[PDB]
Design a binder for this molecule. Sequence first.
Ligand SMILES: [NH3+][C@@H](CCC(=O)N[C@@H](CSCc1ccc(Br)cc1)C(=O)NCC(=O)O)C(=O)O
Ligand SMILES: [NH3+][C@@H](CCC(=O)N[C@@H](CSCc1ccc(Br)cc1)C(=O)NCC(=O)O)C(=O)O
Lengths: 209, 209
Amino acid sequence: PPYTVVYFPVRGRCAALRMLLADQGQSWKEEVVTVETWQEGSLKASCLYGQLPKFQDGDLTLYQSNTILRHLGRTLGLYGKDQQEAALVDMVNDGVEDLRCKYISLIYTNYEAGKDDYVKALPGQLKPFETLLSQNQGGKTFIVGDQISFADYNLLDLLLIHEVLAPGCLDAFPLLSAYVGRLSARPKLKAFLASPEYVNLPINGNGKQ
Amino acid sequence: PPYTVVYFPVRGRCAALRMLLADQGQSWKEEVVTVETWQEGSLKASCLYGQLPKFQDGDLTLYQSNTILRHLGRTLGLYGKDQQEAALVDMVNDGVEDLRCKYISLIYTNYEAGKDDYVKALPGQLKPFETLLSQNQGGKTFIVGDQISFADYNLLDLLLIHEVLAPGCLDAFPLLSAYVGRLSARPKLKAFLASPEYVNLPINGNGKQ
Ligand SMILES: [NH3+][C@@H](CCC(=O)N[C@@H](CSCc1ccc(Br)cc1)C(=O)NCC(=O)O)C(=O)O
Ligand SMILES: [NH3+][C@@H](CCC(=O)N[C@@H](CSCc1ccc(Br)cc1)C(=O)NCC(=O)O)C(=O)O
């Protein structure tokens, strides 16, 4: 710390790290970038990959959303209890990232023509996470081990955005439905999910959801 | 050894972890899956995300290529010297993965019509890595700090397959050109890149490159 997040005024790729910082009781500053200030290209040229989010932690600056999650994961102790759990946390996060990429492609390039097929294929894409919960203490704790990890906040966000795209998509998965319930109830996280800074931001940049 | 790699008979997403293992002097077993054995559905149905590579380290089974690289990075000491370097190693690997996804979409879905526009935009996509090297002791060492990391092997593979797709694409980048030369020369890695085990497998599964 202290932290600063730089991004567009949407939830998008910053939703999971904001949930992690709020639930861990950390403070941070937000620097909002409008499409107007982004279209003038001078901030875009200073970004390593010409994209946002950008993040600061003291004198360290970082890019890439999953690198920011892994960094808070290791500096705050949200990365498993050992190397074996740290590898399982990475395997869940990479799976969450693959489906997040398919969701983003549906939202930004084919929403009207491909949402029915995307929703027809959704059960198959969520089954792996229900299976991972069934293997960890009967799905009664977290996605890996018995302590929360950064992959829990990234998987929670992906489940919450899919319920907005296909209401009831989790009805067929008992353990994922119960897991979204338990984590949404953690005190600091429940207060943050009800706040205007979270509820009043669109999920995506094109208004689709 | 306690290692096993399960994959199709191509270099694909397994090329960087095989170079990492060979350069660190570790042995592993390969289990090859043919397209006929994959079409039998039983092994696909047993994979967590229905895809390969699969990897084992003793009884620990892992999926996702980047999870396998981070697990060997942690167990073999290829993850930076402190928490700040470990975050910069992740930032580099996430950039490498973003460019590998664009390369993969071109190869398997748009190779004939998108090859010239893809090669035209390539320099913009490679400049970030040239900038990272210029910031680390004049590009004379590794991509991060002064010890090799798992991201150096993934970046090296990404640079070698682009030189096959667009020969001379690295001429515009003096530090990346010298970085590929210096890394290909490490004795154990130089021997692996010249062996039939590496040279006789196609880069991708559809024959394009
Ligand atoms: N792999 C990177 C991807 C970052 C990324 O896609 N960044 C997009 C923004 S996220 C998606 C999006 C698009 C438009 C709005 Br309004 C809000 C959110 C960007 O900077 N895009 C700007 C650019 O590429 O010029 C990561 O995980 O961090
Ligand atoms: N995100 C995963 C992606 C793995 C993946 O895409 N896996 C593909 C194969 S890699 C690319 C490829 C394709 C065909 C051949 Br022949 C060789 C290599 C798969 O299992 N595909 C099988 C499936 O989806 O049924 C990772 O990083 O590990």
